[PDB]
Structure formats: C-alpha cells, structure tokens
Amino acid sequence: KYTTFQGSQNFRLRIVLATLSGKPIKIEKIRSGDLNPGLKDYEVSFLRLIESVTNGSVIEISYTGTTVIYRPGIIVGGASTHICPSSKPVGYFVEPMLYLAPFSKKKFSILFKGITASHNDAGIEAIKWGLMPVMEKFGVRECALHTLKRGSPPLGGGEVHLVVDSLIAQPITMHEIDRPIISSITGVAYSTRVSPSLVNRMIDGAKKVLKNLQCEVNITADVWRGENSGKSPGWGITLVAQSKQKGWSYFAEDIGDAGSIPEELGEKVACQLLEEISKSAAVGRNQLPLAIVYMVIGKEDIGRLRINKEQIDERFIILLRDIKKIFNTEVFLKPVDEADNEDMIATIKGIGFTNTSKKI
Amino acid sequence: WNIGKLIYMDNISPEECIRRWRVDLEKFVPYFDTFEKLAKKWKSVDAIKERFEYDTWYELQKAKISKQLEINNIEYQEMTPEQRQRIEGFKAGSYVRIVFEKVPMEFVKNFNPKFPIVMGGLLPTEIKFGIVKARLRRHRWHKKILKTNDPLVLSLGWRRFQTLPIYTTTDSRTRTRMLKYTPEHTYCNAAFYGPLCSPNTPFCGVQIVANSDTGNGFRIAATGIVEEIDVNIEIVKKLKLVGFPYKIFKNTAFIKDMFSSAMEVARFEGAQIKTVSGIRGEIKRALSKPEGHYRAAFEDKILMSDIVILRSW
C-alpha cells in the first residue's frame, strides 16, 4: 500500500528516496499540533519542483494536509524555471535535485530564482566545491551550477542555473578506507552591494587562524557588484580543505548578518572548518547524506567508506532508518584495524539501481 | 554496546542510542559548539596536524571486476551467516522454500507436472505499467506483414501478454507518424502499452499460441528491442483536407468543399496548401457567400480538374 512516515522530518529525503525507488510513500502528521499545521510553502513549492522534473507522478496533499501521499513517476528532467518563495534560499531545492539529475531521461537544465544564501542551508559555494566534487567521485563527470546573479537576504534577486550533462546508469561503487591528506585549503569570499574592503577583512580573519597550518592558503575574493549583485547587501565565506591525491574535500560556510564583524566571521568559519576536519574521516558530515544514498543506489556490490565516530550522530541514525524503510538496505560498520584513531568502515550493498530512464 | 545492533533497534530512540555506547537533516549545516569555546579549542592546531601493468585494456576491466568480486567474498566471509543472509539474501545454489498466498485455485487443481513452473524476480521497473515504444520488424519467415492495432502476444522478460501495438516512423526525425502495417523487410518504431522494462531488453511477438489455430505457418510474427520507456506517446496521423476549385482567376482561385462554414476558413486563414500537380498556394480570405468558400492564390494558375489539398495532422 504505502510505507508510512511521521511529521515533517526528512521531508526532502523521504520524497527523494521514494523517487529513486519508484515505491509510493505516505507522510502524515506534519506539524499536527502547530498553530499553522501541515506543509509550509517552500516544501509545497518543493513538491511542485519534483513534479516539474518527473512524469506521471501523483502527489496528494490531504484536505487537512497533515498527510501527503506520493506515487513517484519516472525522472525526465528537462528545461524549466523555478520561482521560489523567500522562506528558503536556493540551496534548499538544488541539493535534492542533485540526487535525481544523473539518473534522468533528459539533462537537468533548471534555472533558479530567489534568495541564494542563508544560515541553515547550503550556499552556492558549498554546492560548487562541496558536493559536486563528491558526485564527481561517484562518476558524475559533468555537473555545474552557474551563478548568473547572487541574491542576499531578505530581498534576494539572485539567479543560479543547474546543469548536469552527465547521465549515468548508477553511481560507481565507493572504495575509500583511508583518511585523505589535506593538500591545501581554498575558498571564496563574496559580498553584495558593499565595498570590496569587507571581503578583504573576511579573508584576514580566516588567514590568521589558519596560518599555523603549513598548507598553502588561497581564498578567492569574489566581490559582486552592479546589476548582478541582487537587491540586498550581504556577504559570506566558504573555506574548503582540498585533497588532490584522491580529490576529496571538506568545507564550512556561513553568511554574515547585520551588525557582524567581517574579521570575526572569517575567523569563525576557519575554526569551523578545523572542527569539521577533526570530525571527518573520509568526507565531511555535511557530505555524508550525499555519499550514503549514492552508495546505496549503486550496482549490486559492496562499496566501502571510512567514517569517524564524531560523524555517527542523531542525523546519521535517522538517515539510515529512513533508507531501510524505503530500500530495506542496512548499513554495516566495521572498526578499523588501526589504533591511532577510532574510525569506522561503513559497508553497504547497492540495490542494483539502474537509470532505466536514460534512452539508448 | 555495539551500535550495529542499536542502529536497527527502532524502539530505542536515536538520542537514547548515542549516549548508551558513548536534530534534523533539513538543516544542511551540522550542529557546532558555541563560538568562543571553538576558539579556545582551536588556539592550538596540533590535534589535526596529523591529518595533514596489464598487456591489454580488456584484462584491466576484467581485473577491475575480479578485484571487486574478491572484495565481496572477503567481507561476506567474516560476516556472521545470519548477518550475511540479512544483507546478500539467499545466494544462487541455495535450496529454498517459498510460500505464496492468494493463488488461484485453478493452479492447484489444473496442475500438470509436465508443464514447468518458472519463478522470476522482478526489479522495480517491471512493476510499472506504461507505454513501451520500441524498434520492431516483421520476422523474415513470417508470411504476412503485421497491422496496426492488431493483437500481438509479446514475450517480455519473465512475462507473456497480448497487446495492441501501433507502428510508427520518425519521418526524417521530424515527427512520430502512424503506419498502417510493418515494413516488409525492415524495422519500424512500435508503441504499445504494458509492463515497463529496462532498455536493451529484447522480445518476440507471436500472433497465435493455441494448437487449434496453429496451421502450417511459421508463428514467430515480430522481433524487436525495447528502445524507449515512457507513460505517454504523441503518435500522430496525417489528416488531409480536400477541396475543389470552381472559379479560377489566373493565380487567384476560389475553392469549395474544403470547409463547411466561413468560420472554419477563418481558423485556417494563413494556412499552406497545394494541388495534386504540386502547385503551392495559400488561403487568403473566406468568401461570405456561400458558406465554406474561400479565396486562394497559387504560385501559378491552376486548372478546373486540379484538386487542392491542405496537409494537417
């Protein structure tokens, strides 16, 4: 009938996991006790986006709307434009599309419009060098996010174009049982509708923290100004720890609010990136959900990934439980033979998923 | 407290799980400690300073597959036999009991041990039903060509079924046009409704399966490959409207019987037309009297016997 879920918990992923499976799903009791019960506008907008990129799907939201029924169709993609409520930035919707684009009939060419950054969602720079590098490792040779306009909150006005030219049967099996060595640290410091000095002050804050490390540190200053700078003043940073040996990346990001010191923000993210590196074994925590799902939809074979004990957290557990409810797949974990660290090897059998939606 | 068990003990809450063996993914950024504490934690960076030939191509691919296959055996070896069966399932070569429910009583009654019972697993796509549009040809030894909208028993995967296919051409890769019959000795695009299947899945078609109507003819009627799967198709047919001239003035001429009312003409004002001789023309305007008559201009003078045609789909 329907595999039933509860609440607004993991709304995007549960919808996405349903689409990859083709298994119909029901999500119920969404914010039942809230004064404003049921689905919020951005997730309603999200369901529309899911419909735009698929064919034949049936999406029923009940009269009270604390229950949504979803019968997935086939992923078709195609060229489309998405107008997006201000409640979420671009990262909210583009990120789940990353799960669907490589397994589509027609290439995903989605033009996106709205606010481009926030405090709780993936930034543009996070998507560009934090997540496509991961799917590049999984075999997605061509994936790009063109930044046509940057839009800071609250007025936004930004514009980003998602293009995934690579269409593949399924992600390649993963084999990473080691801790990647960080060869260098890079990043982009950006600002909108303000003086270039602010961008220069952020990089100073990041640099002073990280000079103790004997890496090369090169943070780009991407000052956005003029017609393409959006409608509001805003500024942010993203620092990426890069490993050229096997092309692994760990990243941290944040946007500055009114009243905040650029040096303080640049300094904060530097500490955050070092915190993430300490918590990471093979990928950052923010990259784990992308990796595990891609692993699970791989060929009928075991891949291996190295995970730190800091990474197995509340989010990871619920993530795994959702995967089993849809796919029935279980993630098995092994202690690493080393004693220097306490890392963990997650072994997952791919469900033998194949992109039957790609035409030969 | 091994977390391998605790992760799948849904009764234990995830927060309860973590503490024993020691919020939301919609927030992409993970939780971090308070700012000032992180600064004090990272005054010293020392904690993380630690982090910083085969002859032919062919055997390399064979090597990659074998090396990958060897990996599965190694891990499958150490896994507990129950844990293995949980993950890999029942491996081929295993003798197994399978119990089914809701079987028709006719299967139990009309059971003949001579006739085999074959069970075949289904991937997710085989469950879905939709339009299967495919490349098909009449079999060379089959006597007659197939006809559109003619029932055909098709053998796909583990399943056999009867379906009404429609056979189409690309028309120089411009449109999907419907054909009345198969080409005599070549493939054609064939669309039909049934269980979906992965591409590269071949099939056969048979028109008759009963012994009574077998006759002397060779039975395998059609052969093809599923080239496409979708849940619509936009197959179209050429619809030609025919009118007649009754008054001709050099290039200009008046035509009748093409349309019934001037309103019909008005919709098709601006439309392209031609004669049987091939003289291209145009609908200029609808004549007020009588209804359905319209004025047309042609690149050259047409004759009374000429029949004008409007090509539509």
Binding site: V44, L47, R48, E51, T54, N55, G56, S57, V58, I59, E60, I61, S62, Y63, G65, G73 | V231, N232
Partner: peptide, 10 residues
C-alpha cells in the same frame, strides 16, 4: 505533461 499536485486545501 502528466501528474498534478492535487491540492485539497480549503
């Protein structure tokens, strides 16, 4: 285009 967000909201 097939499939629609059948919205039963009042």
């Amino acid at each position: 285009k097939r499939g629609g967000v059948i919205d039963k909201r009042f």
